[PDB]
Amino acid sequence: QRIRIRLKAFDHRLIDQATAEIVETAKRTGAQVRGPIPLPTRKERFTVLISPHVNKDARDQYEIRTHLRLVDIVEPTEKTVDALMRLDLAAGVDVQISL
Amino acid sequence: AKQSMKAREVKRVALADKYFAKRAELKAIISDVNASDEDRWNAVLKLQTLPRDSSPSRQRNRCRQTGRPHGFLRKFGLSRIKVREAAMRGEIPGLKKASW
Amino acid sequence: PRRRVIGQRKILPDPKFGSELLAKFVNILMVDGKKSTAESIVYSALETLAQRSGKSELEAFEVALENVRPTVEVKSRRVGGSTYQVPVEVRPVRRNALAMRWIVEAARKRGDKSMALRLANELSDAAENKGTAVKKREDVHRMAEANKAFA
Amino acid sequence: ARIAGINIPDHKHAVIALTSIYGVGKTRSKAILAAAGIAEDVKISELSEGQIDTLRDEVAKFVVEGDLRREISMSIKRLMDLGCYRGLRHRRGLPVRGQRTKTNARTRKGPRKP
Amino acid sequence: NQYYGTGRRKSSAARVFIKPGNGKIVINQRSLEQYFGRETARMVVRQPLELVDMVEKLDLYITVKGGGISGQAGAIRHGITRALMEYDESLRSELRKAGFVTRDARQVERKKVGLRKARRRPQFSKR
Amino acid sequence: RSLKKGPFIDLHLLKKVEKAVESGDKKPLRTWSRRSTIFPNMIGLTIAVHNGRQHVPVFVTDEMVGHKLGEFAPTRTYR
Amino acid sequence: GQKVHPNGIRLGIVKPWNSTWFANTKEFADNLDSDFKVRQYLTKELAKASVSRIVIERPAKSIRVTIHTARPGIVIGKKGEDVEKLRKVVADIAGVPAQINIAEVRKPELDAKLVADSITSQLERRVMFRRAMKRAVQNAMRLGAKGIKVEVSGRLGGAEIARTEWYREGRVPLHTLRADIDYNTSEAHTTYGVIGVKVWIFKGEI
RNA sequence: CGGUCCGGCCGGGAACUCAAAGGAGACUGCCAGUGAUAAACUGGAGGAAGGUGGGGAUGACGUCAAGUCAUCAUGCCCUUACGACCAGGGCUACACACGUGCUACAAUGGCGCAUACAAAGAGAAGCGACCUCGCGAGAGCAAGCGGACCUCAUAAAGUGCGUCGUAGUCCGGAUUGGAGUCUGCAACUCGACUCCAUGAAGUCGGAAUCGCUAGUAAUCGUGGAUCAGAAUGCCACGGUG
Structure with missing residues (x-):
């Protein structure tokens, strides 16, 4: 049918490297690649008190940005499927394979 | 927190996994269903014979490192102080100071 | 502004008449950022204050302002250990601002039903050289004439 | 005019005039006017006497009048004579429904006294 | 042909397509009077094609998202100015002097820690 | 203000009450279950309800049915 | 006055994170606790090995630890028996299979x-x-x-x-x-x- | 541009909004004048932006033996108790005084009907649609959604029409009585919410005092953390202004 790949990471350079690796794996296999479409970034935020006792007015605001990429292959030759299903990507990147 | 407080939390988690996972879910199901035995389902009396610590509502989220019962964050499982300590040392992935 | 010399912000003209005076009047009458609520009041008051006289609207509003506009006011001063009141000459922009603010506070201190009616009556009184806005202008001029020695 | 609820309602919109009865709020007033067949925006004047008799016939279904005062007095008296927690809170003029007494009990305690 | 211009304000972004000749204005499949019941919002939208004499000389097709009444009206004004400069490019000086080519960058200031609002600080007691 | 799926009563107190009514008049019932609802079969018995330090004797009457036991044992001393 | 942590303020600017995995809310706290326990055990066991930095990254279903030490021969030991013993217990702490690399601090x-x-x-x-x-x-x-x-x-x-x-x-x-x-x-x-x-x-x- | 149940919905298109990665852009760079021909300052052009463009993070040496031994770590005392387990109670008391807020005293408003325009977020022992039942809180059944897709989720001030007509009122909602819903072993002390009923003070606040310089104050809604349930607090978001 068709395979879409959802990539998640906290660093955007890492997710871009992973997406580049994926599109090279696919195009060098001879499949067609739709993407990579940059999906909106989900940035969680946290506000914590930096004092051990009181001092509520003293706080630090932290955040975690989750970067999203979507890669679609329209006709996934068996070559493409079993090529990408054994790709080696960075540790901080989460990859989903939907069929 | 004291050692006894952490031991209490551990025991409560264990009891909640043992009983309320299946038995108390069944009993509360019998209690909430309107179609079943509107007179003597007997489930209400059996729900109180179970240990109290088996109720998940009696668990208190404490920092996984210190046991602090206040300022907890479910995302990290730590209190605000230990969250900040780990964040500044670069031990929480992706977390950094925010500005906008 | 200890050192700050400051410019001027862009006030938009009135949608109905195209006057900056009426726009600032609506701004002064506005509360809680409800500009549409204040514009209806000002327009109803100007309409009601139009048929009475006969000189359209803008003209009636300016005639009402001419009687409330203060020429000279007193500025408190602490030099000789007591309340000095030096009568200073009012600038035209501050003149219009004071006139409009006085008319609004006088209309809000009235017993009529709606703010449109209160405004219409206050403006008609001002055109007739009476009311509480003209009263306040005469109070200010009186206080200036009393302290003319301190110019 | 006058209703089975002795009280005399003012001559104004029927939905609001019927509120003067002790025990009839806005919802019950609307329900009375609906079950009777009278519009809500009509004054008490312009109402025929046959229409006021109709309103009386409908308000007779509710316990809304010194009768209701009696039922409320009976409940508070039962609470006080029972000696329960709410009975004691009623005896001492203190808030009954868990409100704080450190500050802000001025409706039950009245004007403050040093 | 269509001359396009993108206008923006606080949270709004208007897509304005102008075409040669008529007095028609359509905002989001609605007329100007239907879309803007506030007369200031209509005066702001009509404002740029008044310095340049266009009564029934340009047809406007507008869509706008985000923001409120005034933000959307300012975004439409900005987009109309941009489309007019795309259409003639000699009207640049007039729309500059009027102040319409400037993007109003006034955004809502964020809420800060320890303050009740962007600048509103809590009530201070000394003694 | 508990749902309408039946009132609550602690089971130990329930069995104590049945044993007390089936065996005839007895001594006051010492209990800590201030949260139990007073049932009609408790009319006539005197339940000693804990209030924090003592067990306050509460002679149950028909007018008390529906209340919780702790409603008749004040926990705070104020003079 | 109090100063910002100079390391945390530069994270992402010029400083890398010591933990470089991705996880959702479900496993985030678990991974954080397991990383804490691993780092604690490694700091206690290698106290005399001049360990300066413990970088932890979690590939798909495992964990690999990089120990930055100025005494690599002590951490590794004769025929790597010591680093093998370290790995066999890091795998127990983390639950998933473990891998350990040694980076020299020159x-x-x-x-x-x-x-x-x-x-x-x-x-x-x-x-x-x-x-x-x-x-x-x-x-x-x-x-x-x-x-x-x-x-x-x-x-x-x-x-x-x-x-x-x-x-x-x-x-x-x-x-x-x-x-x-x-x-x-x-x-x-x-x-x-x-x-x-x-x-x-x-x-x-x- | 074709088709259409008029719904970007479906062929399609890659233009535009937008998404998010890279780049450009602002440097007193240019012009004029002033100035020790210096640094700079005043104005102008151009430009989306002009003079550290707006906001944030960033807190020097030190001061207050300032706060925290109750997050944690750490250099006298207890130890069949100053340790540990349990049930109930208390931290929620109440003559009173203070700080910080919310709601008001109304007509720039209350109520009724109709209708318009956001942004930012959260969600798997979770968010939970549609439909049915209930006056309602909710209940039953049961999709979709680890989510630019599904759900929370109807923005509200606003606008149109009607009414109220200055009164302790169709303002105000306190308090109290009755009847319920949900969470939870369990709502008595001591939960939140709904319905019916009741309708305190309050008609703009003494001495005094606070915040705020522009998308700011003022006002209007929205979301999140903690959390089984319990926000008028906190943290954030946009509308009008």
């Missing part, structure tokens, strides 16, 4: 963690604090550091009233985010309480 005199550890060890050996601080500063500066300052605090030399002392050489621009500032701390547990040591090492910008 210049221990330029690592803030190792300098702080050296100073705290000297303080616990009853060595004069001024001497230790100046030796650390000199060793770091003669090895090409652009700047260094170390600071010790709390009952120095057994004093009844605590005191904070700091020595500074070169350039330490804590307000420049482009500045590569290596910062770490350590505590000396003495007979008179805790003495906290802080070290800043500046290694240039960009």
Whole structure:
């Protein structure tokens, strides 16, 4: 049918490297690649008190940005499927394979 | 927190996994269903014979490192102080100071 | 502004008449950022204050302002250990601002039903050289004439 | 005019005039006017006497009048004579429904006294 | 042909397509009077094609998202100015002097820690 | 203000009450279950309800049915 | 005044994270706790191995740990039996299969963690604090550091009233985010309480 | 541009909004004048932006033996108790005084009907649609959604029409009585919410005092953390202004 790949990471350079690796794996296999479409970034935020006792007015605001990429292959030759299903990507990147 | 407080939390988690996972879910199901035995389902009396610590509502989220019962964050499982300590040392992935 | 010399912000003209005076009047009458609520009041008051006289609207509003506009006011001063009141000459922009603010506070201190009616009556009184806005202008001029020695 | 609820309602919109009865709020007033067949925006004047008799016939279904005062007095008296927690809170003029007494009990305690 | 211009304000972004000749204005499949019941919002939208004499000389097709009444009206004004400069490019000086080519960058200031609002600080007691 | 799926009563107190009514008049019932609802079969018995330090004797009457036991044992001393 | 943590303020700017995995909310706290336990065990076991930094990354269904140490032969040992024993228990702590790499710290005199550890060890050996601080500063500066300052605090030399002392050489621009500032701390547990040591090492910008 | 149940919905298109990665752009760079021919300052052009463009993070040496031994770590005392387990109670008391807020005293408003325009977020022992039942809180059944897709989720001030007509009122909602819903072993002390009923003070606040310089104050809604349940607090978001 068709395979879409959802990539998640906290660093955007890492997710871009992973997406580049994926599109090279696919195009060098001879499949067609739709993407990579940059999906909106989900940035969680946290506000914590930096004092051990009181001092509520003293706080630090932290955040975690989750970067999203979507890669679609329209006709996934068996070559493409079993090529990408054994790709080696960075540790901080989460990859989903939907069929 | 004291050692006894952490031991209490551990025991409560264990009891909640043992009983309320299946038995108390069944009993509360019998209690909430309107179609079943509107007179003597007997489930209400059996729900109180179970240990109290088996109720998940009696668990208190404490920092996984210190046991602090206040300022907890479910995302990290730590209190605000230990969250900040780990964040500044670069031990929480992706977390950094925010500005906008 | 200890050192700050400051410019001027862009006030938009009135949608109905195209006057900056009426726009600032609506701004002064506005509360809680409800500009549409204040514009209806000002327009109803100007309409009601139009048929009475006969000189359209803008003209009636300016005639009402001419009687409330203060020429000279007193500025408190602490030099000789007591309340000095030096009568200073009012600038035209501050003149219009004071006139409009006085008319609004006088209309809000009235017993009529709606703010449109209160405004219409206050403006008609001002055109007739009476009311509480003209009263306040005469109070200010009186206080200036009393302290003319301190110019 | 006058209703089975002795009280005399003012001559104004029927939905609001019927509120003067002790025990009839806005919802019950609307329900009375609906079950009777009278519009809500009509004054008490312009109402025929046959229409006021109709309103009386409908308000007779509710316990809304010194009768209701009696039922409320009976409940508070039962609470006080029972000696329960709410009975004691009623005896001492203190808030009954868990409100704080450190500050802000001025409706039950009245004007403050040093 | 269509001359396009993108206008923006606080949270709004208007897509304005102008075409040669008529007095028609359509905002989001609605007329100007239907879309803007506030007369200031209509005066702001009509404002740029008044310095340049266009009564029934340009047809406007507008869509706008985000923001409120005034933000959307300012975004439409900005987009109309941009489309007019795309259409003639000699009207640049007039729309500059009027102040319409400037993007109003006034955004809502964020809420800060320890303050009740962007600048509103809590009530201070000394003694 | 508990749902309408039946009132609550602690089971130990329930069995104590049945044993007390089936065996005839007895001594006051010492209990800590201030949260139990007073049932009609408790009319006539005197339940000693804990209030924090003592067990306050509460002679149950028909007018008390529906209340919780702790409603008749004040926990705070104020003079 | 209180200063921002110089490491955390530069995370993503010029400083990398010590934990580089991705996880959702479900496994985030579990991974954090497991990383904490792994780092704790490794710091306790390799106390005499000059371990300066423990980087933890979690591939798909495993964990690999990189130990930055200035004594790699001690961590590895004869025929790697020691690092094998370390891996076999890191795998138990983390639950998933484990892998351990050893990264050498070529210049221990330029690592803030190792300098702080050296100073705290000297303080616990009853060595004069001024001497230790100046030796650390000199060793770091003669090895090409652009700047260094170390600071010790709390009952120095057994004093009844605590005191904070700091020595500074070169350039330490804590307000420049482009500045590569290596910062770490350590505590000396003495007979008179805790003495906290802080070290800043500046290694240039960009 | 074709088709259309008029719904970007479906062929399609890659233009535009937008998404998110890279780049450009602002430097007193240019012009004029002043100025020790210096640094700079005043104005102008151009430009989306002009003079550290707006906001944030960033807090020097030190001061207050300032706060925290109750996050944590750490250099006298207890130890069949100053340790540990349990049930109930208390932290929620109440003559009173203070700080910080919310709601008001109304007509720039209350109520009724109709209708318009956001942004930012959260969600798997979770968010939970549609439909049915209930006056309602909710209940039953049961999709979709680890989510630019599904759900929370109807923005509200606003606008149109009607009414109220200055009164302790169709303002105000306190308090109290009755009847319920949900969470939870369990709502008595001591939960939140709904319905019916009741309708305190309050008609703009003494001495005094606070915040705020522009998308700011003022006002209007929205979301999140903690959390089984329990926000008028906190943290954030946009509308009008």
